[model samples]
Target chain A: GLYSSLPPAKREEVEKLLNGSAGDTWRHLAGELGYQPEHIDSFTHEACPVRALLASWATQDSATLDALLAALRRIQRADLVESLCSESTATSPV
Target chain B: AQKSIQEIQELDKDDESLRKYKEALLGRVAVSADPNVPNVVVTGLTLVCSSAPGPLELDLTGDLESFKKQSFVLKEGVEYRIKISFRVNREIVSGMKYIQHTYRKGVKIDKTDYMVGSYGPRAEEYEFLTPVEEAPKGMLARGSYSIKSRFTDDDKTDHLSWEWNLTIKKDWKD
Candidate 1:
């Protein structure tokens, strides 16, 4: 319900993240939400697509974007140590 | 699964999905009109795409009248932009301004997200100088009543023309 109340900076961050075209990220968001990324495009406006999304989120009982952003921030700040042995970046130490 | 990676490409403009995609998009449109105005009113809206799309139909209905108000042919795959503004500049006749209320959406829908927004412009909510109980001076009123608007999408290939009408009076009795 507070979607429209977001600050301009937060709106900017949200739009920058969502501006990606049809691709893997779109697939991930869609898979989790049971809808295509194109559906999200409806929220895009010339003035500012990001703030538009936030404003729309305010109307919904629950906002998927907010949840996704929170989860992403959590993962980025997780306490897990880095490993370096496997081809993957997170693999065990060499 | 990657014995020899292969890429698949699909690029048919007439793909069934594209047609259905447009239909779904069009469903988001909200159209209305003034009974006093002669044309249909399509509020602030737009269509956007990078490629060539053909002409399509615009159909809208409301509780004011079950019958469709206006129909127009439009280019498909073309991007269009839209903006709408409401104005009230008529002289007070009597009960019209005081009791004469025009109905407009109390909230503005987010164009990009297609959701309702809290910031709404109530064009009809005007303060009347005369009380509803008494008729004011210059009761004989006549002025231009209009809804003016303009819109342009990303590509600037779309066009806008509207017809509107007022379907009812302030009071059901009228």
Candidate 2:
């Protein structure tokens, strides 16, 4: 419910990128976000890996957005990053 | 073969077509008190093609199983006939249902055969005639096709299916 502020389209894009079959996209994201082998262990211990990542996105600050953008660009999904940033900036309270 | 209208109504509450079909089936169930009918299994399916001499008869009852295969490039503005056959385990009256689906780019185009009355204790067959308005193309083009049919009593227990890896191409051909 905390993710209500994020555009539905952006959330959908995140779900697709994270679950996409093109070269373990979520593994790359978790690795790039400074989750060490043991730190990722905590998330993997949960029943669903995607639910854990979504929970992290909902609870964290802009750091998660920056990490997600970098991950998307790394996967050659810069188009998704552009749309995400544009929408977030348009609705930014500050 | 006794089904309460309320029991059949709950099978598929969304489709009035199915409800009407079930209502018609109730009449047949009342007329045919043969309680020895056995389960059925669909054996084979094929497409019937006209050899250009006779007018295409869309009916499936007779003169339908003459050909084994119809090999020709799929073109625009042509009609096609699909023939399906199934076998009964024993000599009795049987009820069957058929569903057809086409998929491309993970989307589905679905068609259902109108289930009417019932079938015999022997093997039964049917045909479906479909008109081609345009060649399947693009993100919605037909990539693969599947036909799944089953007996009403065997629901969820058995789903007899046939599928094809549909390929569409262009260029010179006879």
Candidate 3:
């Protein structure tokens, strides 16, 4: 497919950021990303639910970094976004 | 026995929630300017598409010959809902329903029926909101579909029956 899929490293970063601090924040993150409740429940029984969700979302051609960031903003995870941005800034000033 | 329209309006004089219910159905117009509309006419249909800031309105008041000529682009996989506005004049409307059928390649694929309830003759139009629904998505789901929409009641008194064309695109643009 000519679609842009999130890289494995970026997927891991999303997993880490979504599973940040304490609560199961990734649940809300998946919802804001437009995956319905039944879909979330399908991955809930998996060994690693957030990883499963990312794998599913990665199938769509529109699942780019922008959509991920938009979902993050919608879920109000600025703490994770800002930290991720800061790390990227350290690597490249662009 | 069927309740008269005046009796229904009388209940709102005492109950607050009843007032709220009518407000949702009849809109915020406290009083109507002209109460001389037709018996019962469905005047408008508004599409509240997913992730969109505004609504797309379809006027059903005139001869619908040119209505079908227009195109309605609905985005696949987007959550959306339909809103209908109708006016009642001269008498009470016992009950009404919105029946919509979508077809492709000369075959009927799906149909949905909404039992929009009864309303009395009012100057302002009554608005009915359908349940939230998601448009079909995927490789085979994106295409043009012919839609047959009808507004009627138990007796099948056809108030409005119109055919419209809408294309389900891969994305929501324009």
Least lDDT summed over 10 consecutive residues: which range in candidate 1 chain B? Answer: B165-174
Candidate 3 per-residue C-alpha lDDT over A1-75 given as tens digits, one digit per residue, 9 for 90 to 100: 221432233334444323312234567787887778897777766655765666677788666666676777886
Pairs of residues clashing in candidate 3: none
Q: What would the per-residue lDDT of candidate 1 be over residues A7-86, giving only the tens digit for each residue? A: 34333323332331222223344335444666666533233344354455456656643454444344331111010001
Following a full C-alpha superposition, what root-mean-square deviation does model 1 have from the true structure? 25.1
lDDT for each residue of candidate 2 in B44-95, tens digit (9 for 90 to 100): 5444434221121111222221111111122223344555556654544434
Per-residue error for B172 in candidate 3, Å, reads 1.8
Clashing pairs in 2: B92-B121
Ranking by TM-score: 3, 2, 1
Q: Report chain B TM per candidate.
A: 0.18, 0.45, 0.71
User: What is the per-residue lDDT of model 2 for residues A11-83, given as tens digits with 9 covering 90 to 100?
Assistant: 5434432332222335556776666888676765654465467667567664455556666676554533443
Docking class of 3: incorrect
Best by DockQ: 3
lDDT score for residue B109 of model 2 = 65
User: Residue B84 of model 3: what lDDT?
Assistant: 84
Among the candidates, what TM-score does chain A have in each? 0.36, 0.53, 0.69
Residue by residue across B60-118, what tens digits does model 3's lDDT show?
A: 76756544433354566777787888888656777688898988745898899888888
